[PDB]
RNA sequence: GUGAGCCCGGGUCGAACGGCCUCUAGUGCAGAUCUUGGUGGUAGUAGCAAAUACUUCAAUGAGAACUUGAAGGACCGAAGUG
C-alpha cells in the first residue's frame, strides 16, 4: 500500500537510548542509534546522515546531545549500477519550535 | 641370521656403484643444563587498556576508523603538542 519513495516525520527520543552511556561515547551512539531508527523505521540497511543532522547531534558536544529530536526520513530509491540495495534512507534535522508533543506524520510529496 | 645386520619385491629417482682377500682410519651415539640447524604442545592463548575523542557527507580506490576536501566536536594553552 505504501510506496518505496516516501518521506516521514518523526520524534526521536534519544535520551532513553542514551540512559547510562560513557560522555565519551554519547554523541557516537546517538549517531548510531538515529542510524538504527532509521533502518527499524524504513526497512532500509543504508542510511545516510545529513551533515546539518550531525552538527545538531554534536551541537552541545560530545555528552550533551538533546533528548528528542525531530528528523526527516526519505525513503529514496538507489539509481547507481550495481547497488546491493535498492532503496536507501536520507535523514534530516527539521527545523520546529519544539520536538515535544508531535506524532509521527506523512510529509507531502509536493 | 640368536643378534649387530644381509638379501629381494614395489614406488620415487637420475650417474655411478658393489662382492671376495689383504691394507688403512678423523670408523658405529639417547643422553654430555652437549654443538649447529629445523620443528611442536602451550595457543588462535597471554595480550595489542598511560598521554581526555571522535562524528557526518563527498571524492579516490578492488578494498577506507586510522587517505583527502568540506562540515562539526575537542586537546596542547606561550616553562606549548608553537
Known amino acids: 500500500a505504501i510506496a ?3 518521506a516521514r516525520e518523526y520524534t ?3 535520551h532513553k537510548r542514551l540512559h547510562g552511556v560513557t560522555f565519551k561515547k554519547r554523541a557516537p551512539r ?3 542509534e538515529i542510524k538504527k531508527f532509521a533502518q527499524k ?3 532500509t540497511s543504508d542510511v545516510r546522515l545529513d551533515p546539518q543532522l550531525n552538527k545538531k ?3 552541545q558536544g560530545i555528552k550533551g546531545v538533546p ?3 525531530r528528523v526527516r ?3 529514496r530509491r538507489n539509481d547507481e549500477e ?3 540495495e535498492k532503496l536507501y534512507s536520507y535523514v534530516q534535522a527539521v527545523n520546529v519550535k519544539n520536538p515535544k508533543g508531535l506524532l509521527t506524520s506523512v510529509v507531502e510529496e509536493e
Open 4 to 6: 518505496d519513495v516516501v
Open 12 to 14: 526521536i527520543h534519544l
Open 30 to 32: 546517538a549517531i548510531k
Open 41 to 43: 523505521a524504513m526497512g
Open 57 to 59: 547531534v554534536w551541537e
Open 67 to 69: 533528548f528528542r529530536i
Open 73 to 75: 526520513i526519505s525513503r
Open 82 to 84: 550495481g547497488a546491493k
